[model samples]
Target: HHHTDPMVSKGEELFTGVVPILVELDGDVNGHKFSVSGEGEGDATYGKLTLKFICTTGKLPVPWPTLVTTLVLCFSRYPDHMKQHDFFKSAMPEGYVQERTIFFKDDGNYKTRAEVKFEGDTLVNRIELKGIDFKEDGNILGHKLEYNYNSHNAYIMADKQKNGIKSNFKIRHNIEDGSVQLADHYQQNTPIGDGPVLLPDNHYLSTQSKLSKDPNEKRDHMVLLEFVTAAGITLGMDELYK
Candidate 1:
């Protein structure tokens, strides 16, 4: 008896398309409401993607840039492993400044470094992807991020080595409910348009969970990954567009 595996032939095709995935979190931190959202596009197979995350809350000194930098550094250094809580604790210290420099051996021998300086009530985060290769034209070489304690607003700009290319983000926070909204802008260096074109059909993913004293009453986390097509059709984990 010969059994043919149909999925074997289609497996390669299943992993080649361009798909964008969004991750969102809404919960409470230190008795205050907190929320985070991120989105990125990448190949379904290789999983080499660049994702941007924005976390906002009415609470002071969220330290978003520092968190992002540490996470990125951890992945670059140990792409195939996790160090648990110890990993996170190492990235942060009890101080007014946090800084680290990581040297990468692969991909043109680049150096990634980040610094967070707390001055008075303002936090300034600066990250640089430097080296010989990154100095070339059309490369994103650095970022300057600034956040305020009182206003709870953040502004970040990516510096592409080339002129005219624009990449920036602005996040606004609502003090009432601790909700935040982020606007991400990206554009190539072109003379055709005066501003970046906003992509349509934005999709979103949300996760929710609950914890209770009774083990049986605790609810596991639930995830919803959805996409809205150009025609306004919604798709989810159960539906994969061919």
Candidate 2:
């Protein structure tokens, strides 16, 4: 599943030093959903960001499992620097289910890549880190996720023994409004707070990450909250960017 095109490899160089703060889906296309949200730090500019489709119901005519799995991978590899649309066209000139792998170099590290595959009604996504030497002999910051079509849910399992922590998160897609709710293992089956919300004209806003802070805390909670929410409201609007 290695990407053969030079452009796809070149695209991987775009995401270095960028930190994705949030992403959301905001609109629908012929009853299917369509939207994009992204935020970056460092040298990553909003104008340089490009939108491409990996798999969509409108174009690819794939089932929900395939589409949802692609979406999960998109989020998991936030600020996806690869030109997936071009890669998809080049990799599978004919429509069919098959596994694919795309190599990526994060910053200066050339040991990361994403593996995607579909099985039955589920899509399995794995991000692997290679060429790393760890004290535990196999420690890596990789993620394994599965998206199930039957329940229209996506789950991601993450582990970091070096940090002594492990956690899982779930996403429930409400296709009606093109919105999704994210919950942790402890809050399973319950929407802890608002996730991302769809807005007018293919726009999206995320308020789920907001939090109230003590006035005396070192960090200015109110300022950070206002900044994030305001950015979510203003920047999330697609029309404004156009």
Candidate 3:
């Protein structure tokens, strides 16, 4: 049940770690043909994600290929890489690590156990992501998210925040939710980008049924949530990394 150390198998991620469990979309989370573009400065922290799904012909599933793509994007916000530090040293002109930690209410810690932090903590993040452009239901279909630039504070949820170590941080563009801005293209100063926008905004992968009214509403390009999910070494974009 337990391990020798946290770095071994217990907490330390060796082969396929939490990224595997972060299984979004639906069942067949496997994918391939990933084209990553690196942005920002010297070390390069921000960029867009172009991922292709490895659709299965058989019954079971395609594991690592798909999950690996997710890992790449998710890991961008990796805790260790986004550590809190001094103002004069590592901070850059692009952006700075605003905050990264789990938060619990002073009055109602458990009742309102929360985590507050900034995504572009150091990178001044407004990261954009476009899944892929392929021949699915036809006509360049996929998922994407915008922002790839500024970083600020976000009060994220850690309802089941657990394990010995307590925190981790992190979205929305899909719904025309409210007068609360975040409406379509101008998702500026967005509270948090999660759910449908949890994965995308200028985003694709989202198919039909839900937001059937939007003028630009396309079919579920890369949707496996309903039916199933493409392509081989293809992409809708390639600008940053090359």
Q: Indicate which candidate wins on lDDT.
A: 1
Q: List candidate 3 segments past 4 Å from native.
A: 1-10, 15-50, 53-76, 81-154, 160-242
The sequence of per-residue lDDT tens digits that candidate 2 reaches over residues 1-242 is 23465544543343334333322323332233333332222222221222222221233211222122222222123122223322211221111222222111221111222333323323233333222221221111221112222222222121222211112334342323343323222111111123211111211111121223345635211111111111111333466558
What would the TM-score be for candidate 3 when compared with the true structure? 0.20
How well does model 1 score by local distance difference test?
0.27
- Which 10-residue window of candidate 2 scores lowest in summed lDDT? 223-232
TM-score of each: 0.24, 0.20, 0.20
Candidate 1, residues 1-242, lDDT tens digits: the string is 11142322232222245444344444332233445554444342332334545544443223343223222111111111111111211222211122233222221222333342222322223333333332222211221223221212112122234212222223232222353323222212211223222121221111111211223422222122212111112445665665
Clash count list over all predictions: 0, 0, 30
Which 10 consecutive residues of model 1 have the lowest summed lDDT? 73-82
Pairs of residues at least 3 apart in sequence or in different chains that clash in candidate 1: none
- Model 2 score (lDDT): 0.25
Q: RMSD per prediction, one decimal?
A: 19.4, 21.7, 19.4
Task: Decide which is better by lDDT, 2 or 3.
Answer: 2
Model 1 residue runs over 4 Å out of place are: 1-5, 8-12, 56-242
The local distance difference test score of model 3 is 0.21
